[PDB]
């Protein structure tokens, strides 16, 4: 009588058992082939203002005991009872200045254990048990001496400004050096000896080369793309370096985007980035309507027609550009169109967005920063917090490279559970379920410590899985009453 609905899920479970067997085998094989390998380690050294006293400056400010700042050497010399004590700009953590009408206070704070908060924590001092000068405050009268030249507080103000400038320059140079150390040098852009070269125009770039976005055009070269801003900022992206090419159309979006996930990081705008986007907007933003109102059958519907035409033209242009790049590269770089129907709401970086699974990468480009997960490197997936009284669950992507951090996607409507399972089943990915949230950090660390023992216990199969009953007894077999 019952509906009687069958379930291919059993076929899914069998396919998933096969995938789990293959996964265990391949994981064991790769870990046994690895068996530990070489590593890399660099050196470093603290900063020095002057290696010897002979390099000390000789300035009238120093002679008069005024807070001097040497820019070429990046040092700040301050008076300490007739002692011109120097400090490298790196020692100073920050500086502040206050005016109290009669006097001006200039405070200078250095780095020290406990105060090394932020991205400076890794800068472990060579001897944390020593005495660290944490604060030094100077006071200068604001009253101009009788017909003299400058005011004492003017010296403190000038010192504050110069120290801020030197600190800005020093931090800029340090950031540049730190981001250049570790870049994979890319080949030079083979200038287009070919006379054709497909090109596309009107494209805002992400991240921004300058402080704000830059409008520009793109040109497909023999071995890469060249992005040129309206001013002249040239950025190169070789084809061999492109790991994934995504094309997110404007069907239901405010921007038509071309996203490039690179295998190595390219440096531009004095910063290195792994993801790039070139988009064109087709949206509108207003207080509600146009702050006017009167829009009849001569601008409103006309505006809709214009918007549709612009969307269509941009879609056509993007498809033309894609086809030209493909034809020029001879299928060496293939673009991927994400399947919007197979998407689901997720929160990778804790921001509700619509992840879309292409055909070889789970992506999301409309929301910046981008999200990209290549399915070729996915070890497996785990659904945590999948119970009855929970309208949302989490997904955990474990990569083959155990030295990386697992990708955790929180808040996913339960209605989107079986679809994600079928998508993963088609992708040939093993998915398991878990009722509680596990400590993935400890799990991965333990697996890296004992991989063989891990497999001996069972490998990744660990994620997979008294009372009587009120039975119809003689007291239950009783009959009904009479009429």
């Amino acid at each position: 009588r019952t509906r009687n609905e069958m379930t291919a899920e059993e076929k899914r479970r069998a396919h998933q058992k096969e995938l789990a067997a293959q996964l265990n085998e391949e994981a064991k094989r790769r870990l046994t082939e690895q068996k530990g390998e070489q590593q890399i380690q660099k050196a470093r050294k603290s900063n020095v203002s002057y290696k010897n006293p002979s390099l000390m400056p000789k300035e009238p400010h120093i002679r008069e005991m005024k807070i001097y700042i040497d820019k070429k050497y990046e040092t700040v010399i301050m008076p300490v009872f007739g002692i011109a004590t120097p400090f490298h700009i790196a020692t100073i953590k920050n500086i502040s200045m206050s005016v109290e009408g009669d006097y001006t206070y200039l405070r200078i704070n250095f780095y020290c254990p406990g105060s090394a908060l932020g991205r400076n924590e890794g800068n472990i001092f060579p001897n944390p048990e020593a005495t660290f000068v944490k604060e030094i405050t100077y006071r200068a009268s604001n009253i101009k001496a009788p017909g003299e030249q400058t005011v004492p507080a003017l010296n403190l103000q000038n010192a504050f400004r110069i120290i801020k400038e030197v600190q800005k320059r020093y931090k800029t140079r340090e950031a540049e050096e730190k981001e250049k150390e570790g870049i994979v040098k890319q080949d030079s852009l083979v200038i287009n000896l070919n006379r054709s070269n497909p090109k596309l125009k009107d494209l805002y770039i992400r991240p921004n080369i300058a402080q704000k976005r830059m409008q520009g055009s793109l040109e497909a070269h023999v071995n890469g793309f060249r992005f040129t801003s309206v001013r002249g900022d040239k950025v190169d992206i070789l084809y061999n370096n492109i790991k994934h090419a995504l094309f997110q159309p404007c069907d239901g979006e405010m921007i038509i985007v071309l996203h490039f996930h690179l295998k190595n990081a390219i440096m531009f705008g004095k910063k290195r980035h792994t993801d790039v986007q070139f988009y064109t907007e087709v949206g509108e933003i207003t207080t509600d309507l146009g702050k006017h109102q009167h829009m009849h059958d001569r601008d409103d519907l006309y505006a809709e027609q214009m918007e549709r035409e612009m969307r269509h033209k941009l879609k056509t242009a993007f498809k033309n550009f894609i086809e030209k790049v493909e034809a020029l590269t001879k299928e060496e770089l293939e673009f991927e169109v994400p399947f919007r129907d197979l998407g689901f709401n997720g929160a990778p970086y804790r921001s509700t967005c619509l992840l879309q699974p292409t055909s070889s990468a789970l992506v999301n480009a409309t929301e910046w920063p981008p999200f990209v997960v290549t399915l070729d490197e996915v070890e497996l997936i785990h659904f945590e917090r999948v119970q009855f009284h929970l309208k949302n669950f989490d997904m955990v992507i474990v990569y083959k490279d155990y030295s990386k951090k697992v990708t955790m996607i929180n808040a996913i409507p339960v209605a989107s559970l079986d679809p994600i399972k079928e998508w993963l089943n088609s992708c040939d990915l093993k998915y398991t379920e878990g009722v509680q949230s596990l400590n993935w950090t400890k799990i991965m660390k333990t697996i890296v410590d004992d991989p063989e023992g891990f497999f001996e216990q069972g490998g990744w199969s660990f994620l997979e899985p008294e009372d009587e009953t009120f039975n119809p007894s003689e007291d239950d077999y009783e009959e009904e009453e009479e009429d």
Partner: protein, 89 residues
């Protein structure tokens, strides 16, 4: 009292080779009582709307179609129709 005996009969009829737990039987009874109450409340609402003094098979069918989803409601309506036919037969 409860519908435990009837639930056990239906269970033996749909799967004559299986059992159940005490918590499972309790959950089934709670479900039976809740469905009964929902359908009865909807039927009372419809009867008060129609200004009738007797709940009828038509009222019950309307209540079922208002409560249960589409396919499930259609199957339940078919089962109830067959049952009432056999009863009146």
């Amino acid at each position: 009292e409860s519908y435990a005996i009837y639930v056990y009969k239906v269970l033996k009829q749909v799967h004559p080779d299986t059992g159940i737990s005490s918590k499972a039987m309790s959950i089934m009874n709670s479900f039976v009582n809740d469905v009964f109450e929902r359908i009865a409340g909807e039927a009372s609402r419809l009867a008060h709307y129609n200004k009738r003094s007797t709940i009828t098979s038509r009222e019950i069918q309307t209540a079922v179609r208002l409560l249960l989803p589409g396919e499930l409601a259609k199957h339940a309506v078919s089962e109830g129709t067959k049952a009432v036919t056999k009863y009146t037969s």
